[PDB]
């Protein structure tokens, strides 16, 4: 009798945890990524204009 009652209380929170954890991660991470992507581009644009003004002035 006693085995199955514990077995299942284990399995159920296990599958609850992983599914809610998998959801929770993606939102903020991809929010994460979204921004790095706009960064990665943006960077170089600033650099490059700024650099142009030095380069010609020399």
């Amino acid at each position: 009798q006693l085995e199955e009652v514990k077995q299942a209380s284990i399995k159920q929170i296990q599958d609850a945890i992983d599914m809610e954890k998998s959801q929770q991660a993606l939102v903020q991470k991809r929010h994460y990524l979204f921004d790095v992507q706009r960064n990665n581009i943006a960077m170089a644009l600033e650099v490059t204009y700024r650099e142009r003004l030095h380069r010609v002035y020399r």
Partner: protein, 121 residues
């Protein structure tokens, strides 16, 4: 200058790489840091020449003054986008991420929790 944090990002980035780009992101992280530190350093703009000293005291001023006019008239563009519908394939990837996983998973979890009731026993 050019970049920013959005969400939580340079740390929160690197660890987490959607399989459909997963491998790329590991390499991309380190590239980004290179750009980051570089840009922050550069000068942003030089001085802009003291003409008064040079025009008066470089007395080939026919040459100097003509070159002056060409320089003062000289107009300048900006660099070029190439890679920023990634920015927009973002909102698409953001659907995939929430609703495409959000929804199906929320219905799954629905079942796991309802089954939790009986297995208290």
């Amino acid at each position: 200058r050019k970049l920013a944090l959005k969400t939580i990002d340079w740390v929160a980035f690197g660890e987490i790489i959607p399989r459909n780009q997963k491998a790329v992101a590991n390499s991309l992280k380190s590239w980004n840091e290179t750009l980051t530190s570089r840009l922050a350093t550069l000068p942003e703009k030089p001085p802009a020449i003291d003409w008064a000293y040079y025009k008066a005291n470089v007395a080939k001023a026919g040459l100097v003054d003509d070159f002056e006019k060409k320089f003062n008239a000289l107009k300048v563009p900006i660099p070029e986008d190439k890679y920023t519908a990634q920015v927009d394939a973002e909102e698409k990837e953001d659907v995939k991420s929430c609703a495409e996983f959000l929804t199906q998973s929320k219905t799954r979890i629905q079942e796991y929790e309802k089954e939790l009731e009986k297995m208290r026993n």
